[PDB]
Amino acid sequence: MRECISIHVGQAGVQIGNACWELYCLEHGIQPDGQMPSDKTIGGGDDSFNTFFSETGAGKHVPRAVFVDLEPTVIDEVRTGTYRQLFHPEQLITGKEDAANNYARGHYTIGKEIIDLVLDRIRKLADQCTGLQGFLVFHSFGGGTGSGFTSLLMERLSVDYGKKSKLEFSIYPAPQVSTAVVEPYNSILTTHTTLEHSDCAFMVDNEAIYDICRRNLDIERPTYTNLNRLIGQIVSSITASLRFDGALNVDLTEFQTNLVPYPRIHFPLATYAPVISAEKAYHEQLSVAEITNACFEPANQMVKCDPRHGKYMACCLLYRGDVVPKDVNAAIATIKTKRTIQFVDWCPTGFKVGINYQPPTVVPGGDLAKVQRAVCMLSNTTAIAEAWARLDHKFDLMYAKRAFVHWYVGEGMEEGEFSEAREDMAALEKDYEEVGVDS
Amino acid sequence: SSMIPGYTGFVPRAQFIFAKNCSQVWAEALS
Amino acid sequence: MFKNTFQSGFLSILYSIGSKPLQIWDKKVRNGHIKRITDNDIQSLVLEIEGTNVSTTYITCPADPKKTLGIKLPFLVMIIKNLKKYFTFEVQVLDDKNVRRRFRASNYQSTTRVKPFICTMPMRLDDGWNQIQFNLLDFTRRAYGTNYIETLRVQIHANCRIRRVYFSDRLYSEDELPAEFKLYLP
Amino acid sequence: VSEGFTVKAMMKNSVVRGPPAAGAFKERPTKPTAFRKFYERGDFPIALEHDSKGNKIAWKVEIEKLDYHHYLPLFFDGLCEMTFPYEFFARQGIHDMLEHGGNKILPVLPQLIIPIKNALNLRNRQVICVTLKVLQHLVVSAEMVGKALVPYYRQILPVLNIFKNMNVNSGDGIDYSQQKRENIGDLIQETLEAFERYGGENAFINIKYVVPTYESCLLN
Amino acid sequence: MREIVHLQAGQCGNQIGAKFWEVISDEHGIDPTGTYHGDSDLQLERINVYYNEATGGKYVPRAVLVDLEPGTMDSVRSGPFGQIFRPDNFVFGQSGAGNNWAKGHYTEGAELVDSVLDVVRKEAESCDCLQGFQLTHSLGGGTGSGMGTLLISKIREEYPDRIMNTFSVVPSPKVSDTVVEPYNATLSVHQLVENTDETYCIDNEALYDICFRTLKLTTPTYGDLNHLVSATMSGVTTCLRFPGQLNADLRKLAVNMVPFPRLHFFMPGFAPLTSRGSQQYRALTVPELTQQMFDAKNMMAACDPRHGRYLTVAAVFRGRMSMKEVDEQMLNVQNKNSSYFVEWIPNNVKTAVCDIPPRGLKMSATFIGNSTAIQELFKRISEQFTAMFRRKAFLHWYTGEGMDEMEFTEAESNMNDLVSEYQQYQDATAEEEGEFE
Ligand SMILES: Nc1nc2c(ncn2[C@@H]2O[C@H](COP(=O)(O)OP(=O)(O)OP(=O)(O)O)[C@@H](O)[C@H]2O)c(=O)[nH]1
Ligand SMILES: Nc1nc2c(ncn2[C@@H]2O[C@H](COP(=O)(O)OP(=O)(O)O)[C@@H](O)[C@H]2O)c(=O)[nH]1
Ligand SMILES: [Mg+2]
């Protein structure tokens, strides 16, 4: 009955989306062709699959996903690959002549031709829903489709749908390595039109997942397949309380309430523990206290910002597997006794705990090994005040000479919308230092 | 029939076959 | 700063005519410049702030980041020149509930947004020399519906010419102004 | 020390030498001009009148009936002179001919672009200030002169782009040399707004095409 | 889905594009007859980007061959892959230009461009959604440059909101085999700076240097020269015809590389090039590709990048490779060579990765650098133009055909303004202070 609609937008949305639905089929024992096997049963058949699937009376399951792109190079891999039969043909939405890494082209020129077609398919997926928990949006800040069309995808989802939850799974641009030159220009303008239309916004950047895949998983040369397998495990653990019964279950609206202190502050840091390979998975006894220390360790964060430089607001720990409520409350009390982890003085009950029963599921060909228990942490720190203080420098380092402005202006954007989005970020930097300062 | 409708790739001699759907014209083009 | 001092009528925190106009204002310049030149219309010295980037070049009061002004007077009045380039200014107040708020006035923004930490409103600058009269008491009772207690920081950003930023206890007309405060055009 | 893009640069402790400076801001040496060789030969009907009030060129013949096709390209060619007797005859002769011109200034404008550009290409600060004072005065000479410089924005403005950023940063020091008007970056903004106001409808998009950091002054 | 119409002007353009069409027919698996004989399904997935379907399972290129002498296209059609072109796509004059830009622009060129544009309209309106046009030519002759500039200036007027690539073999100093060459070059850059979306500068001198002291070729003929240009042309647009992990087509590359509308002259290079003797002994990975593509002897223009500052660099890799190495090596290059990159643009390098490697190679890389060292390539042509034009040599062969003396000086002035704006964007600081002292 609790139902969600995934909206994968852009090449980063689709390529992450192929990792998630390969994982979601294997958690529920669904074959790539759509139908559960008759000779075998993988797990007891329940209504647990109803959060992401809709069951045709003949016995087929169709995902509640809408794949959105402006070029056909990446969608036709879905239309030809192993999962060609799983998706309904009209869900896979494809435009022409992409966005050319241009926010103004993906907002004012190209996206206005496809906006009415996507919102009609969103209606026919949310009309079948007897009660909608909320949509999930997967996108990246760097490109044009994932930044421009996603900016006005939520502007029309907010007018049509009143207070339905719209979660974000963004890819923040890394501080040092980046595959673009106009990349600061896209992320300043994206956040300006997303601070108001998003109910939550988790961030992972590609540089920190590169470091974790090398020191923890012992992968010398990570690709984009190994990065998307880690992001799929985080989004599974968020929704694992929606589908499977647990001792302490947390709905989507429950940790949405219990992480944001103020409406502007919805930028959690997502960490996962443990991330260990198959040779070291079976020698280590991973207790509840062992896996909850790796979340607070500053090298294991998935955002390139150091939590020791700031103060925590609130946390949301999500344990799955063979865990008991005694070992959780003992392990949290150890964290509170240390003088290096620092919490704000107006939040004494800093933690929220969720416990599930079903352990994480390993995928064939993956890198992580199957473990009996795991934890996903969504912390909220004042250490995110330094991620934009670099990116406010990079935006101001080019905009004083007006580099690349002649491309965005010619597609319909005025000159002042670059500056009025810069003032909207300098108001946010002062917003955290007044929240984080003690009384 | 190894592709689904909406496929934007090129299929040989598919423009000549008419008044059939995507799967039928792809089958008649491959056969 | 001005907690101990008397506060009635006007309070002046800047003037373009003096030995050190910017004694208490902190000057942060980047891709910009600040100077003091004679005006072409009023035949008197004005301050200068220019720059291609609006955000980096500003002057803030007080100079110390920790210190606060603490001004009880309601209306803030500025005398600045329109140059038809981008210009902003901040005022930071203290409500009845002891929560610091903000009011940003951009001449390029068209949307008016309200939020508990900052409420940004547009502005239209008439050509030539003009006088800005701000209402801190009504804008706090309109955006948040709380009372007004004191005002802490005032920032003036790029692309303007500043002379005699001053507070008041109410809005006098041009007749009730003294000789020093009214702008004297030839 | 080492040069870039080598195996010697890709060491743990090596030092890399940067590129040499191009020379976009350095002063360029001058060349002999045609104004000097036509004044010494004796074609110009000019003479320097030492007055009590100042220095003013006295014209033997009337200024209205002069042949502006032959002299206006020649007097703009004296803008590259820095020695005393030629720099004063250049700029002061320019302003008087533009003052009493009337209807005939417009057809000479195709022939005036080349000495305008060569005056700004010396990268000498004193020449740039005087040339920019003429360019503000040139556009207000007649009615239809201003709309004719719009095709010629691509040749004058690339040097105005270089020196628009220079200005004094004395944070509270008073400028006591405002009368001389030597601030080039104050003059370039003053010059560019005069091009746009008299240029017409299509003046703004042409200036912003060449000078990137521009903001419209007529439009609100 | 996105179609590109190839256009080629002159003898140099015809030879270069004939080699290019042979190269990408080999890439897409097409016999000299024209039919498809391949062993993969990814070759035929996106073939409408360049080819046009015919009757009977045949594919003909979307190419238009404009020329002022029929012997060159006879040599083109009598080649190995010359029978796949439709015979309607050849458009020839009857009398040659004579290495005269005036003849190829005003006198003889105006009688052919209507017949050319009929074929261009016919071949470009029969597409699904056009990406842009492509042109290959050289700035030394009259047919390639004089007709080419007018052809671009008419195609841009007819289709403004399209992309336009050109590959200019600009003249070289020490190899120059034409007396009247700098006149044509100086009058051609004047049009290429205003009517073109992207221009790729290729030098015959640098082609000889690369083909000799890196490829180790005893006899580098023009076939071995045009192989390099064809490989670069394939590597630029392989992201548009083959699926990749991180893909970027022509519009994306133009948007991320061109900072200002007057600065679109690019330097190419290719990365895994090596001799036949040393091919078996050399292990090629991402560091080797990065080193060889950033090496200063590997530039396909006679311009040393150490003489200026890189404005914007792009690299298009081909093969199966990991993104961590691709990002790490070109972070290391920027970090080590800190002074040769502009300080008012951060992370100057754009990356793209395509999956399918070229024929016979397991990994390859293509370099496109927008550098500032093109100022010397412009000043050399400017001084060679001024030396000849000051005494007015060979001027009657242009001014008897309907031109003025003012246009030469106007072209020189425009190209000197171009030089000045590369100079200001070279010597520009992040903080506008420390320059005017
Ligand atoms: N985390 C992660 N990021 C990716 C992946 N693939 C691409 N990206 C990011 O995506 C950003 C650019 O977006 P694109 O990949 O071009 O896709 P897009 O957002 O739709 O942009 P367009 O191609 O212009 O439509 C890059 O900066 C990458 O960081 C991936 O597999 N994982
Ligand atoms: N790179 C390269 N250059 C060539 C080739 N053929 C001719 N050239 C150069 O082009 C110049 C002559 O240009 P030309 O072919 O006459 O131009 P056209 O008048 O359009 O035919 C000569 O200096 C050659 O160096 C070729 O196949 N490859
Ligand atoms: Mg893309």
XYZ file of N, CA, C and O in Angstrom, chain A residues 192 195-196 262-264 393 396 399-402 415-416 419-420 422-424 426-427 430-431 433-435 437, chain C residues 30-31 52-56 86 88 90 92 100 102 104 106 108-111 113 115-118 153 155 157:
216
model
N 19.661 27.174 -6.324
C 18.785 28.335 -6.180
C 17.321 27.970 -6.401
O 16.437 28.482 -5.704
N 16.316 24.653 -3.369
C 16.211 24.824 -1.922
C 14.762 24.917 -1.460
O 14.466 24.641 -0.293
N 13.849 25.301 -2.349
C 12.452 25.457 -1.979
C 11.573 24.288 -2.408
O 10.530 24.055 -1.789
N 15.585 23.276 10.269
C 14.980 24.436 9.636
C 14.756 24.104 8.168
O 15.408 23.202 7.632
N 13.812 24.787 7.501
C 13.452 24.391 6.123
C 14.580 24.466 5.105
O 14.546 23.730 4.112
N 15.572 25.331 5.301
C 16.675 25.415 4.353
C 17.677 24.281 4.502
O 18.447 24.029 3.570
N 33.814 30.244 -4.221
C 35.036 30.800 -4.785
C 35.145 30.484 -6.268
O 35.455 31.370 -7.068
N 32.817 32.619 -8.262
C 33.275 34.003 -8.315
C 34.610 34.146 -9.022
O 34.978 35.259 -9.408
N 33.211 34.307 -12.799
C 32.153 35.254 -13.129
C 32.601 36.711 -13.071
O 31.862 37.588 -13.531
N 33.787 37.001 -12.540
C 34.292 38.367 -12.577
C 34.818 38.755 -13.952
O 35.000 39.950 -14.215
N 35.075 37.782 -14.824
C 35.475 38.029 -16.202
C 34.395 37.649 -17.202
O 34.598 37.833 -18.405
N 33.263 37.125 -16.722
C 32.129 36.685 -17.541
C 32.543 35.641 -18.577
O 32.265 35.771 -19.769
N 20.906 38.176 -17.516
C 22.204 38.295 -16.862
C 22.080 38.270 -15.345
O 22.968 37.747 -14.665
N 20.986 38.806 -14.800
C 20.848 38.919 -13.360
C 20.563 37.612 -12.652
O 20.761 37.527 -11.436
N 23.659 36.319 -10.967
C 24.019 37.010 -9.734
C 23.000 36.774 -8.628
O 23.378 36.626 -7.462
N 21.707 36.733 -8.966
C 20.690 36.521 -7.941
C 20.702 35.098 -7.400
O 20.113 34.845 -6.345
N 23.776 33.746 -6.967
C 24.980 33.832 -6.149
C 24.667 34.422 -4.780
O 25.238 34.000 -3.769
N 23.750 35.391 -4.727
C 23.325 35.944 -3.446
C 22.550 34.922 -2.629
O 22.532 34.997 -1.396
N 21.902 33.968 -3.298
C 21.122 32.958 -2.595
C 22.023 31.922 -1.935
O 21.586 31.198 -1.034
N 25.293 32.900 -0.783
C 25.979 33.631 0.278
C 25.072 33.866 1.476
O 25.561 34.121 2.580
N 23.756 33.807 1.275
C 22.839 33.823 2.405
C 22.838 32.489 3.134
O 22.531 32.436 4.329
N 26.080 32.190 5.674
C 25.815 32.862 6.941
C 24.721 32.159 7.730
O 24.639 32.328 8.952
N 23.874 31.377 7.055
C 22.771 30.702 7.731
C 23.263 29.589 8.647
O 22.654 29.341 9.691
N 26.418 29.372 10.140
C 27.285 29.787 11.236
C 26.474 30.358 12.390
O 26.909 30.288 13.545
N 25.296 30.918 12.102
C 24.391 31.366 13.154
C 23.600 30.216 13.767
O 23.199 30.302 14.931
N 23.341 29.153 13.005
C 22.738 27.961 13.592
C 23.740 27.240 14.484
O 23.417 26.838 15.608
N 26.493 28.309 16.042
C 27.137 29.019 17.140
C 26.388 28.739 18.439
O 25.156 28.610 18.459
N 37.499 42.962 -3.624
C 38.012 41.900 -4.483
C 37.403 42.101 -5.859
O 36.173 42.103 -5.986
N 38.262 42.263 -6.870
C 37.859 42.654 -8.225
C 37.043 43.945 -8.200
O 36.045 44.089 -8.907
N 33.049 44.500 -10.874
C 32.302 43.669 -11.809
C 31.467 42.626 -11.082
O 30.437 42.183 -11.603
N 31.887 42.223 -9.887
C 31.170 41.243 -9.085
C 30.517 41.943 -7.902
O 31.176 42.698 -7.181
N 29.221 41.692 -7.715
C 28.459 42.384 -6.680
C 28.799 41.839 -5.298
O 28.874 42.592 -4.319
N 29.021 40.528 -5.195
C 29.046 39.876 -3.889
C 30.342 40.137 -3.132
O 30.325 40.274 -1.904
N 31.476 40.194 -3.833
C 32.760 40.247 -3.140
C 33.050 41.625 -2.558
O 33.658 41.729 -1.488
N 23.996 46.644 -10.973
C 23.453 45.831 -9.888
C 23.905 46.350 -8.526
O 25.068 46.714 -8.342
N 22.904 45.925 -4.057
C 22.167 45.341 -2.941
C 22.610 46.008 -1.645
O 23.613 46.723 -1.601
N 22.098 45.001 2.894
C 21.472 44.231 3.959
C 21.219 45.092 5.186
O 21.924 46.072 5.441
N 20.227 43.810 9.340
C 19.983 42.690 10.237
C 19.375 43.217 11.525
O 19.942 44.110 12.164
N 17.716 36.630 15.159
C 18.222 37.604 14.202
C 17.702 37.307 12.800
O 17.817 36.179 12.311
N 16.943 38.978 8.562
C 17.624 39.704 7.500
C 16.607 40.262 6.515
O 15.461 39.813 6.451
N 17.070 41.622 2.477
C 17.940 41.862 1.334
C 17.143 42.550 0.235
O 16.059 42.087 -0.131
N 17.478 43.656 -3.505
C 18.146 43.588 -4.793
C 17.316 44.330 -5.830
O 16.088 44.212 -5.851
N 17.622 43.714 -9.011
C 17.459 42.812 -10.143
C 16.500 41.665 -9.868
O 16.025 41.037 -10.820
N 16.213 41.371 -8.603
C 15.251 40.330 -8.273
C 13.836 40.799 -8.579
O 13.485 41.954 -8.324
N 13.027 39.901 -9.133
C 11.616 40.175 -9.367
C 10.702 39.439 -8.403
O 9.573 39.884 -8.172
N 11.159 38.327 -7.837
C 10.351 37.556 -6.907
C 10.587 38.017 -5.475
O 11.710 38.346 -5.083
N 10.405 36.688 -1.673
C 10.418 35.435 -0.936
C 10.502 35.733 0.552
O 11.173 36.682 0.964
N 11.108 33.901 4.473
C 11.733 32.768 5.141
C 12.140 33.235 6.531
O 12.405 34.429 6.714
N 12.179 32.343 7.529
C 12.473 32.794 8.902
C 13.857 33.387 9.093
O 14.066 34.119 10.067
N 14.810 33.098 8.212
C 16.163 33.612 8.378
C 16.481 34.788 7.471
O 17.283 35.644 7.856
N 15.880 34.862 6.285
C 16.140 35.960 5.357
C 14.936 36.126 4.439
O 14.400 35.150 3.908
N 23.635 44.776 12.118
C 24.607 44.980 11.052
C 23.942 45.586 9.826
O 22.781 45.301 9.524
N 25.166 46.261 5.716
C 26.154 46.089 4.660
C 25.704 46.830 3.411
O 24.515 46.839 3.082
N 26.710 46.903 -0.629
C 27.444 46.141 -1.626
C 27.823 47.025 -2.814
O 27.775 48.255 -2.751
